[PDB]
Amino acid sequence: NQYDNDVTVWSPQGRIHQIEYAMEAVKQGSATVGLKSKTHAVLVALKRAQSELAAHQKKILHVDNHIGISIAGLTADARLLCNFMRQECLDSRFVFDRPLPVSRLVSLIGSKTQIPTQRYGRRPYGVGLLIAGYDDMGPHIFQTCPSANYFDCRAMSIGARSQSARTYLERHMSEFMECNLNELVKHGLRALRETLPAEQDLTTKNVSIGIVGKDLEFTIYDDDDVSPFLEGLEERP
Amino acid sequence: GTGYDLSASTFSPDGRVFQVEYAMKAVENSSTAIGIRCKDGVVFGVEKLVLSKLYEEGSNKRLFNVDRHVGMAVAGLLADARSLADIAREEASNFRSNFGYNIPLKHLADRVAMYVHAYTLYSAVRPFGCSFMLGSYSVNDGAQLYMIDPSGVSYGYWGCAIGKARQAAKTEIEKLQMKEMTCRDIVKEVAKIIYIVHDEVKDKAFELELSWVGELTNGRHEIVPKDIREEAEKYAKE
Amino acid sequence: IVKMEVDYSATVDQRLPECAKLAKEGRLQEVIETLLSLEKQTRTASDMVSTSRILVAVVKMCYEAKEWDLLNENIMLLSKRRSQLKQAVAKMVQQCCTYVEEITDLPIKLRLIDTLRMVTEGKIYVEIERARLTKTLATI
Amino acid sequence: GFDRHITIFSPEGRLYQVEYAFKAINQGGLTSVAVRGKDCAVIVTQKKVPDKLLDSSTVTHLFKITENIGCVMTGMTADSRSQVQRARYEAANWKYKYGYEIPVDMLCKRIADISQVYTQNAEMRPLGCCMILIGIDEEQGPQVYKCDPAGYYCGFKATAAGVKQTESTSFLEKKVKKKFDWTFEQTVETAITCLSTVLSIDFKPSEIEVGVVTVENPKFRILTEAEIDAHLVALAE
Amino acid sequence: FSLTTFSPSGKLVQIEYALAAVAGGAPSVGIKAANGVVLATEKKQKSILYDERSVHKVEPITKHIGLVYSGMGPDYRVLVHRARKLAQQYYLVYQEPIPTAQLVQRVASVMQEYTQSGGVRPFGVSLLICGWNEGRPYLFQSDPSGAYFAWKATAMGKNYVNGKTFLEKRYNEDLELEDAIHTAILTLKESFEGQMTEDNIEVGICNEAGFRRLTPTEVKDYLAAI
Amino acid sequence: YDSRTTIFSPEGRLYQVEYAMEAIGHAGTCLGILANDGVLLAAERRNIHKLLDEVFFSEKIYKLNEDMACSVAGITSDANVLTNELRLIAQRYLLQYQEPIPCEQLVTALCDIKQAYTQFGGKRPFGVSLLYIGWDKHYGFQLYQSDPSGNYGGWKATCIGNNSAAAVSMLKQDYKEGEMTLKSALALAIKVLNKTMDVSKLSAEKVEIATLTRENGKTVIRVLKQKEVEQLIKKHEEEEAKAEREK
């Protein structure tokens, strides 16, 4: 279609096509949800497994004691973004000894990812980021698309078949501020479980939880740590 | 078309740059905006599509604060818009560091327009897909308002609109009698014009981001207090 | 031709008859100049009826005060200032046509040729040509 | 192929890119007239202002490059402003490197050299804006020059640029062939009547902006509404 | 790529298109006489709006090096500026040789930045160089891609073929005095369409005393009695 | 099929380089013949338009060093820069070692630069092939031929011109090593140049020849001027007349 070949070129109908293709990178990825509360931010990621022998890969990456991210999509240029965010947060610690506020970090990520969308020979960072952080204004959940247009969200999910999780979160987002930690984690687990087909179900080995709170630094819970949250699942596949 | 609208460095057979002619289409497709120079200040206003209720209170706001007294209301591709806002902030900071005091709005608009023209001149880089208004007020220079197209140049505007429905907004803007109306009623009227522009006829519910600058704020471009301007939104609804 | 911007119908109504009284015998030219400024304001406001009334009043003042020479350069200035409004000048020639035919006099031949020179600058088929035909017949 | 797509020599032995840029100057819907006189040089261009929401105070196409040189721009406004900024930088740099003020011919030569560099290479593109610059020069009288997107800097006495530039140049050729020098009333009136005959609107004294540089009075006077109105009244008399 | 390029099997297609472009339409004849060299060209300005004392076709690169050119004048300006810088650099390095004709060959050789580093798009101007600081005159031509040719009489215009034919038939010869400028003007006359005048024709002469661009007075004087 | 210079072929050939080297055969004509106590170069002057002055004093033959000289046969634009680089390399070696550069080392450096030009980057191959004649302390008189492919060869009687095949065949037919001397080398060079140039009775102006000889502890590279060249032509003409009439 000629106009869809390169990122720099502009389509006659309006927006360019390469970035629109870039948003399909996050679409073709394992689902992940992230929701806010009054005091906590929780990420529920689907650890997609290659085979039963191999592990379920790694999601919900660690950035700092108060910030944790969940990737979705092209994993190659995603550890790069994780390194960039870690470096910026550590630079903030080194310069003025305070946790880098999540909004400023997300703005930095957007500015950094905007340049490849305009420089020839540089592909956009086709990675969807679900950043969970606890700045001084309570928990925060941010979604970063490869279009470098971030969003703030009470509860957002990205990945394959994530629309069902989005609908469930929207229908249940009213009762999100006033929820206990376990209650919110179970809300997220129900949201993620509704994404996969009925054959699949939540297991301790294929799920990951990232929780950050006022007194709780960011922690990545898995199978043994997930089991207390996985109890009381109310399984309706 | 065909081989001429591929890079900005390729001139058309008639002598046109089709890359910018297509970048303007993104601004034409994105949501609209409005900025009115009141008698003693400039009042902004932008409607923003809440594409999903999953989002929190108004985020990725089309309004930005590029300097202490200067604000930017942008429309189009929002990521490059934020990058250009960062560029404008850096330019204002550099000017304040070098020449002191506060950057005049005309010079800031000229410099950012020259930077945008530099980005649309070459071939490797692509023209910015955003159009924005720069509004500021000072006691010495009164109130100014400059609007920059994705490839054009800053122009002095008593009242301007950009985005999805430019002509529809501009008709009622020219209907409104500026240059003698205080910024309060101008806030009310920009909210009224935005609600006159279609919001839910074919889209979702829209939020009203309105900005302020003027002697009533002694410069210091800030977002209008939304709690007390909800009643202005109510008057606009009526 | 062009859309009206600012009407001065109230201004001309309240002032033109007062100006006529102030210059009943036409000894004052400041009255002529101030209506020239007023019709210039309406001309820049693109109003035709106000300009036409001003021109009709100006020539009517010259008729009653019988300044034949001052009429000649006055109508020359009016028709050559910026060409004004084609409706207004076409009107002004028409009442000039109606007036030159009632007073025999010696220099009406000069009045006839003066208006002929004002209309022969062009705009014959457009904006009244029967006046020029009548003037030429009047000269005959 | 790509002979007509990039700045490369055509098989027929031509350069099509600059040939397209020259027509790009015609694109935009504007015209300008430059007339050199016995002692002064005046430039006038129409001020096409759509709707009054614009600020007629700053919609101008004529600028002061230095204290004695003034330009008028024809073509795309962004490239016009960029070239005006470049010309101002060149004038300032010349005054810094060389004590005396930059001659208008030398400034035109430098701008044309920059434009020739632009039409050289292939990474960049020529700027679609034609600049006519005037200024008083000692031992030379008034001086008028034109720099084009190609790099050919020339033009004198009477020179015009814009959409209907050919008709204006023809009328000015007729006027200059009529052997009579124009004083500082006849030069302005000649320019005004040229631009009026090109575009017959009778030129209400608000839609044109004239720049004047005389010998007894230096500097680029951007004549106000009163001056242009007085000149128009004197001409239409 | 970023140099002189586009050379297929056995051809220099881009260079050939540059040579088609420099065919131009400005004859710019050059004659190497015994006493010196004459470079005469045609300034046929469009209409009378343009000026002839404002822009020049003949440029003195240094004290006794004069330069005339062909199509693509804007390229020629940059080329002559580069030539002036190169000659000045040579004179600064080898201080005070009064280098013109022991430099004319050298400056023609250093016209390798002229084309051997083309700059993506090669230059579209062919230039004739004259110098006489050796006790003997010199006439050299540099084309959009080649190098020095060391001409004795040539033309580089639209009718350069018939101009060169006229030059050889009129016997450019070797005993001709400095006033072979008459023959140069006659050669221009063949490739000229109009009544050539002092401002219409620009000519520079380079003799053993130096180089000088003839003012319109002498150009008209020579054009008289032709 | 051709593309950016640094490519291959489906078979595995450098068809751009091969095309350039074949194009070298087109246009230009130089030949070098090596003999004892003297090695010479013969060049064909392509354009003999009467409107030149011949002040450069050499077009094909270039003096590149005190002990060597070359002759290009490609496009002049690359030929000039290649000769400049070759002189620079020779003089750099002279500065570094305080000794004239051996001919083989100089030719290897030049062919290395040409191989680099055809190896990496989006740069055109140097479309020029040149001969070299020279003398050194180790191998004495030497002759080398380098092609744009960067693969030089140590020759003793070769041609690089348009009718290079015909010229080398004529050389092979009438070449005798050992017995060859400077005068016999001159005779053979003039004869083969007359063979490869269709117009018989070649003028001294259309042929430029240079001979390198070893004087007393010093290398002299003399280009044969017009009078000596035409005297050689006259001697060759006498030989041809005697040979033809004696049958």
Side-chain angles (χ1 to χ4, degrees), chain A, chain B, chain C residues 1-7 9-124 126-140, chain D residues 1-97 99-155 157-237, chain E residues 1-113 115-131 133-226, chain F residues 1-18 20-67 69-247:
Chain A
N1 191 23
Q2 296 84 33
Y3 307 89
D4 68 325
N5 198 345
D6 188 83
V7 46
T8 287
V9 309
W10 272 73
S11 319
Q13 293 177 335
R15 293 182 183 174
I16 61 171
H17 282 117
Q18 197 69 226
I19 303 301
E20 300 177 346
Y21 300 147
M23 303 184 301
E24 283 303 324
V26 72
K27 295 306 292 295
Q28 193 172 356
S30 58
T32 302
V33 317
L35 26 283
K36 183 169 71 172
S37 78
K38 183 178 179 180
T39 59
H40 304 94
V42 177
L43 313 180
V44 186
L46 182 57
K47 291 174 65 175
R48 168 179 298 176
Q50 166 203 160
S51 293
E52 65 141 346
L53 293 187
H56 301 245
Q57 263 196 9
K58 187 172 309 304
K59 298 179 63 175
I60 304 191
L61 304 183
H62 208 338
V63 162
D64 189 301
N65 310 85
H66 77 309
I67 297 182
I69 78 177
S70 291
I71 69 179
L74 188 147
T75 173
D77 289 345
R79 189 154 47 255
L80 176 52
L81 278 188
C82 177
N83 294 293
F84 178 80
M85 299 173 59
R86 288 175 178 170
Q87 185 44 57
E88 298 302 330
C89 192
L90 297 165
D91 184 81
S92 167
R93 313 331 300 261
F94 183 72
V95 295
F96 24 65
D97 256 354
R98 63 95 178 269
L100 177 63
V102 193
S103 64
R104 293 185 165 76
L105 182 54
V106 176
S107 64
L108 292 171
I109 300 147
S111 297
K112 188 265 192 300
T113 54
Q114 203 288 136
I115 312 175
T117 67
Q118 292 174 349
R119 268 298 182 169
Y120 176 81
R122 302 304 307 277
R123 66 184 182 277
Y125 286 170
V127 182
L129 292 194
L130 274 188
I131 310 175
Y134 192 82
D135 58 68
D136 302 77
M137 306 176 57
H140 286 62
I141 299 300
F142 292 104
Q143 174 201 356
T144 290
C145 60
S147 69
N149 181 12
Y150 64 95
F151 304 99
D152 189 324
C153 55
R154 335 164 81 261
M156 185 54 176
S157 61
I158 50 182
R161 295 139 311 185
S162 56
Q163 316 81 15
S164 59
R166 289 166 175 177
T167 55
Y168 179 75
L169 291 183
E170 191 190 30
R171 294 183 181 277
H172 281 203
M173 80 165 187
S174 298
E175 42 175 350
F176 271 7
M177 292 177 72
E178 293 177 350
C179 285
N180 289 337
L181 177 63
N182 281 265
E183 295 302 320
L184 178 62
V185 172
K186 293 179 179 179
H187 282 297
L189 293 172
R190 282 166 272 192
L192 187 50
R193 178 189 41 76
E194 202 171 349
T195 301
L196 295 174
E199 293 177 350
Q200 317 298 331
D201 63 326
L202 301 189
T203 83
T204 70
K205 293 179 179 179
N206 77 325
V207 78
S208 184
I209 304 302
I211 304 180
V212 63
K214 170 192 306 181
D215 61 356
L216 179 52
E217 293 177 350
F218 188 85
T219 310
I220 303 177
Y221 313 74
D222 56 354
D223 65 9
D224 289 345
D225 289 345
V226 156
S227 295
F229 309 110
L230 207 54
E231 293 177 350
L233 173 59
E234 295 302 320
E235 186 170 355
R236 293 182 183 174
Chain B
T2 73
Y4 294 73
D5 37 2
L6 177 63
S7 174
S9 180
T10 67
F11 255 108
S12 76
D14 289 345
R16 274 159 44 193
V17 296
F18 272 88
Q19 285 305 322
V20 333
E21 284 192 325
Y22 299 160
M24 294 177 173
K25 302 298 298 185
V27 171
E28 183 178 2
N29 272 228
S30 187
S31 60
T32 194
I34 176 185
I36 307 303
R37 175 201 289 195
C38 295
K39 184 185 193 301
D40 52 10
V42 170
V43 166
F44 280 141
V46 175
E47 81 300 338
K48 168 59 187 186
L49 301 62
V50 175
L51 295 174
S52 180
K53 293 179 179 179
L54 304 171
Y55 304 147
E56 183 178 2
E57 293 177 350
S59 69
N60 57 98
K61 55 198 77 63
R62 297 293 174 75
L63 306 182
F64 298 102
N65 306 36
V66 292
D67 199 0
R68 176 169 37 187
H69 61 124
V70 196
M72 161 192 298
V74 75
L77 201 61
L78 177 63
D80 81 18
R82 294 200 88 269
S83 77
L84 193 41
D86 184 1
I87 287 292
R89 291 198 247 273
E90 199 285 331
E91 179 69 25
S93 66
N94 173 267
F95 185 86
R96 172 167 297 105
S97 302
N98 297 137
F99 301 90
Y101 70 119
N102 288 8
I103 173 152
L105 185 51
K106 68 164 74 60
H107 175 271
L108 176 57
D110 198 358
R111 289 281 277 268
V112 69
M114 199 193 62
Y115 179 81
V116 170
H117 167 266
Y119 258 86
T120 180
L121 185 63
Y122 293 149
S123 62
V125 310
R126 84 191 151 81
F128 291 160
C130 72
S131 171
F132 56 94
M133 297 75 170
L134 299 160
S136 85
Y137 169 88
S138 176
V139 177
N140 314 335
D141 297 4
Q144 295 180 313
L145 167 52
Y146 287 82
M147 198 279 301
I148 284 86
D149 289 345
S151 61
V153 76
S154 59
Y155 275 147
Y157 274 100
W158 297 100
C160 176
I162 203 60
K164 183 169 71 172
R166 181 177 65 83
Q167 293 177 335
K170 288 195 64 181
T171 299
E172 299 323 273
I173 291 161
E174 192 173 358
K175 179 62 173 171
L176 180 58
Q177 204 294 313
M178 321 147 305
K179 305 178 301 301
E180 286 79 12
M181 292 190 180
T182 55
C183 55
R184 298 275 297 277
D185 57 71
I186 295 307
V187 175
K188 304 178 191 54
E189 290 308 322
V190 295
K192 183 190 183 69
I193 301 310
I194 293 191
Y195 283 120
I196 288 314
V197 182
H198 311 105
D199 287 18
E200 80 295 321
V201 185
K202 293 179 179 179
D203 289 345
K204 214 73 173 187
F206 286 178
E207 63 185 342
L208 266 297
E209 317 178 5
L210 283 66
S211 167
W212 241 352
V213 59
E215 60 86 8
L216 85 173
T217 61
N218 58 88
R220 188 61 154 80
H221 168 278
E222 91 296 336
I223 295 189
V224 304
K226 195 69 199 65
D227 58 78
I228 211 53
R229 298 314 160 183
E230 187 166 14
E231 57 76 28
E233 177 176 330
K234 183 178 179 180
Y235 161 74
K237 195 100 174 188
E238 183 178 2
Chain C
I1 311 187
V2 298
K3 286 298 180 183
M4 199 278 303
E5 187 92 16
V6 169
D7 195 332
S9 303
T11 313
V12 301
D13 203 348
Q14 69 89 12
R15 184 176 179 179
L16 188 153
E18 190 276 331
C19 296
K21 173 260 176 182
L22 183 63
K24 190 62 179 61
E25 64 180 8
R27 74 281 191 190
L28 294 174
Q29 308 85 13
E30 63 89 13
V31 64
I32 320 175
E33 296 158 358
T34 186
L35 281 71
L36 296 183
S37 308
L38 164 68
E39 61 86 20
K40 181 53 158 59
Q41 188 274 331
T42 61
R43 156 164 63 258
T44 56
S46 295
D47 190 299
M48 284 73 74
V49 298
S50 53
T51 52
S52 178
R53 168 183 171 176
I54 291 298
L55 304 189
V56 169
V58 166
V59 293
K60 179 61 179 56
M61 293 261 298
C62 295
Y63 305 155
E64 65 178 350
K66 65 179 73 175
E67 69 275 16
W68 311 115
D69 56 329
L70 282 72
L71 182 62
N72 289 20
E73 292 83 4
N74 189 359
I75 191 167
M76 284 181 176
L77 186 61
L78 264 47
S79 60
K80 197 172 44 59
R81 185 174 181 182
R82 190 269 298 164
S83 302
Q84 199 172 357
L85 294 307
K86 297 86 194 173
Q87 288 70 60
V89 290
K91 282 287 213 53
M92 174 173 50
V93 171
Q94 176 172 344
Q95 293 83 18
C96 290
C97 165
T98 315
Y99 182 78
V100 294
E101 67 166 351
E102 61 86 20
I103 177 154
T104 71
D105 211 12
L106 188 153
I108 300 299
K109 59 184 73 179
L110 170 64
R111 267 293 308 109
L112 297 169
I113 65 180
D114 192 328
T115 300
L116 285 183
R117 298 285 75 77
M118 291 315 79
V119 65
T120 196
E121 61 86 20
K123 182 174 72 68
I124 312 293
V126 176
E127 297 281 356
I128 294 301
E129 59 278 17
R130 291 193 297 274
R132 179 169 183 81
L133 307 188
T134 316
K135 298 292 180 68
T136 297
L137 204 62
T139 56
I140 301 299
Chain D
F2 295 99
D3 297 327
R4 325 168 87 95
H5 294 167
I6 65 188
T7 67
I8 208 56
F9 266 149
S10 75
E12 199 172 3
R14 336 173 81 266
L15 194 56
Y16 285 141
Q17 220 60 229
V18 290
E19 179 178 337
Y20 295 145
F22 270 85
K23 291 161 67 178
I25 277 77
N26 289 284
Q27 191 274 350
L30 71 159
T31 46
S32 64
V33 175
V35 187
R36 185 171 73 101
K38 198 184 198 67
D39 49 303
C40 78
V42 296
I43 62 100
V44 63
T45 177
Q46 64 180 20
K47 183 201 287 182
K48 183 178 179 180
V49 63
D51 289 345
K52 63 179 303 181
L53 310 180
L54 277 301
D55 293 5
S56 52
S57 56
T58 66
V59 71
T60 168
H61 286 348
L62 39 147
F63 318 87
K64 296 202 314 174
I65 305 299
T66 182
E67 203 68 30
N68 302 332
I69 279 74
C71 295
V72 63
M73 300 303 303
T74 59
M76 297 179 297
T77 56
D79 309 17
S80 310
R81 300 288 182 268
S82 176
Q83 258 187 6
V84 164
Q85 185 64 240
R86 182 57 57 85
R88 299 158 107 96
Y89 179 96
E90 289 299 322
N93 185 94
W94 178 292
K95 185 173 177 56
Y96 175 79
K97 185 271 313 178
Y100 72 119
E101 204 76 23
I102 170 158
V104 63
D105 59 84
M106 277 307 302
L107 202 161
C108 200
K109 180 172 186 177
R110 268 296 295 183
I111 298 304
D113 288 7
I114 266 60
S115 190
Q116 193 278 346
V117 176
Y118 270 100
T119 182
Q120 267 279 12
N121 315 87
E123 35 189 7
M124 56 266 295
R125 91 167 203 281
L127 284 79
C129 60
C130 181
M131 160 191 312
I132 294 169
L133 58 154
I134 61 171
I136 191 66
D137 179 7
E138 307 174 3
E139 318 98 27
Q140 297 293 343
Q143 292 279 332
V144 47
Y145 289 92
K146 156 199 294 306
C147 48
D148 47 9
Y152 161 77
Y153 84 107
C154 184
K157 296 188 57 182
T159 299
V163 197
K164 290 181 167 50
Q165 64 167 311
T166 63
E167 302 75 357
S168 45
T169 51
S170 60
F171 167 80
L172 299 176
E173 180 166 356
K174 298 189 307 183
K175 227 54 179 293
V176 301
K177 198 58 178 298
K178 201 173 310 305
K179 291 298 182 181
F180 68 103
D181 269 357
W182 315 263
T183 59
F184 190 30
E185 293 177 350
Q186 275 188 326
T187 299
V188 182
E189 290 163 24
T190 300
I192 293 318
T193 188
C194 160
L195 202 52
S196 175
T197 45
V198 168
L199 295 174
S200 75
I201 194 50
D202 316 335
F203 272 156
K204 178 180 68 272
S206 175
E207 299 314 308
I208 66 182
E209 188 163 4
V210 63
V212 175
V213 166
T214 59
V215 51
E216 293 177 350
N217 168 260
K219 295 178 183 56
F220 187 61
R221 295 176 64 186
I222 300 186
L223 275 66
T224 87
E225 293 177 350
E227 277 74 5
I228 65 184
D229 173 77
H231 280 90
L232 274 169
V233 165
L235 174 64
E237 210 80 347
Chain E
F1 196 65
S2 289
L3 275 66
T4 189
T5 180
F6 273 14
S7 293
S9 62
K11 293 179 179 179
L12 324 168
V13 175
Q14 186 57 217
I15 288 318
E16 297 180 353
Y17 298 165
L19 290 174
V22 63
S28 71
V29 296
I31 292 184
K32 168 192 171 179
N35 298 81
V37 181
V38 164
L39 302 183
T41 182
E42 293 177 350
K43 272 169 48 186
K44 201 175 182 62
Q45 291 300 285
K46 293 171 49 58
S47 77
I48 66 185
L49 305 184
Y50 300 156
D51 194 287
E52 291 70 16
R53 75 189 63 260
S54 54
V55 72
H56 301 254
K57 277 207 173 296
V58 183
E59 291 273 8
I61 294 169
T62 178
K63 293 179 179 179
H64 337 125
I65 298 184
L67 189 71
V68 77
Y69 72 115
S70 166
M72 297 302 302
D75 293 10
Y76 159 66
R77 293 178 179 83
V78 158
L79 189 52
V80 69
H81 186 11
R82 195 70 48 89
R84 289 171 170 179
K85 289 219 168 190
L86 290 175
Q88 214 57 218
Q89 289 171 6
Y90 176 95
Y91 161 76
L92 193 271
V93 171
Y94 306 92
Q95 178 50 225
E96 253 181 342
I98 294 169
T100 299
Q102 210 173 34
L103 186 49
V104 69
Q105 43 185 341
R106 308 323 305 122
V107 66
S109 181
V110 189
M111 296 297 103
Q112 41 191 346
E113 185 65 26
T115 172
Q116 303 171 6
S117 184
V120 185
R121 183 181 77 82
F123 278 85
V125 51
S126 166
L127 60 167
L128 322 180
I129 294 169
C130 56
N133 192 263
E134 265 291 309
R136 52 169 287 99
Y138 289 87
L139 202 173
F140 286 79
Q141 165 205 2
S142 202
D143 65 81
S145 178
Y148 63 89
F149 296 162
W151 278 114
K152 192 169 195 308
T154 176
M156 294 300 293
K158 51 188 176 183
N159 297 121
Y160 74 102
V161 189
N162 289 337
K164 184 179 311 179
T165 296
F166 191 92
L167 281 173
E168 54 191 358
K169 299 296 183 181
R170 272 243 167 192
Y171 267 76
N172 63 347
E173 207 260 3
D174 317 66
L175 189 133
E176 303 298 335
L177 292 176
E178 178 42 46
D179 291 62
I181 186 167
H182 151 88
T183 63
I185 291 309
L186 259 299
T187 304
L188 295 174
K189 178 182 180 180
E190 309 301 343
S191 300
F192 194 96
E193 42 163 349
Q195 174 251 355
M196 50 174 39
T197 59
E198 71 281 5
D199 51 359
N200 209 152
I201 292 304
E202 168 169 312
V203 54
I205 69 168
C206 163
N207 80 303
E208 308 299 316
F211 175 77
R212 175 174 88 269
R213 176 168 50 205
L214 276 179
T215 87
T217 298
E218 315 93 34
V219 178
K220 186 189 59 57
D221 284 319
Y222 277 102
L223 252 180
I226 288 307
Chain F
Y1 275 102
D2 46 324
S3 295
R4 332 190 86 82
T5 302
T6 189
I7 47 174
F8 259 76
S9 73
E11 293 177 350
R13 300 288 182 268
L14 295 174
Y15 274 144
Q16 176 70 3
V17 172
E18 290 162 273
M21 216 206 70
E22 293 177 350
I24 303 301
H26 182 197
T29 288
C30 307
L31 71 98
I33 165 69
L34 159 67
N36 314 133
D37 59 280
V39 46
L40 72 75
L41 285 158
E44 198 180 48
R45 298 296 299 278
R46 203 93 188 281
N47 306 29
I48 303 301
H49 208 165
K50 39 190 287 289
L51 290 187
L52 274 62
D53 56 356
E54 308 95 16
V55 63
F56 40 77
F57 177 80
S58 54
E59 172 193 25
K60 280 294 206 299
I61 312 297
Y62 287 96
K63 179 184 306 194
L64 62 80
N65 178 278
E66 166 55 33
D67 287 356
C70 60
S71 319
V72 309
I75 61 171
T76 169
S77 301
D78 302 10
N80 296 328
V81 62
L82 206 56
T83 51
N84 290 269
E85 276 288 341
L86 199 56
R87 297 180 187 176
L88 177 64
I89 291 309
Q91 277 305 325
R92 176 173 297 101
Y93 183 100
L94 180 56
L95 164 72
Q96 206 170 19
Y97 293 91
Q98 185 64 60
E99 186 130 334
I101 166 169
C103 295
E104 204 213 7
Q105 289 192 244
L106 171 89
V107 174
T108 47
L110 195 56
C111 76
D112 282 2
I113 215 185
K114 286 197 300 181
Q115 159 63 15
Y117 262 78
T118 173
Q119 173 77 316
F120 76 130
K123 58 178 75 64
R124 54 157 64 178
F126 269 7
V128 63
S129 178
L130 59 175
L131 302 161
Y132 326 80
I133 61 172
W135 182 89
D136 78 312
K137 35 167 299 180
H138 307 84
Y139 292 163
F141 301 93
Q142 310 182 52
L143 163 66
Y144 290 85
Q145 182 266 92
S146 57
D147 43 12
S149 69
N151 193 172
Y152 79 97
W155 287 92
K156 292 189 292 185
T158 174
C159 168
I160 205 64
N162 37 28
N163 310 31
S164 74
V168 71
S169 306
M170 177 66 47
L171 289 185
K172 179 176 299 296
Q173 181 186 52
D174 299 357
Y175 169 102
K176 293 179 179 179
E177 63 185 342
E179 293 177 350
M180 57 196 336
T181 59
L182 178 72
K183 312 168 65 65
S184 295
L186 282 177
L188 177 63
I190 303 301
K191 189 178 73 64
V192 63
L193 251 182
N194 153 80
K195 287 292 192 307
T196 183
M197 198 161 196
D198 289 345
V199 175
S200 182
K201 183 190 183 69
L202 62 80
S203 308
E205 183 178 2
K206 73 192 51 165
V207 164
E208 183 65 13
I209 61 171
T211 63
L212 182 151
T213 175
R214 190 61 188 171
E215 288 289 346
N216 46 338
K218 171 172 171 291
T219 294
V220 170
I221 306 179
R222 170 173 61 255
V223 296
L224 272 295
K225 293 179 179 179
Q226 293 177 335
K227 293 179 179 179
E228 329 179 80
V229 170
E230 56 201 348
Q231 284 201 354
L232 295 174
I233 298 175
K234 183 178 179 180
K235 293 185 183 179
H236 170 261
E237 205 70 283
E238 300 178 17
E239 289 182 346
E240 303 320 304
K242 299 296 183 181
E244 293 177 350
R245 294 183 181 277
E246 279 196 4
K247 69 176 57 179

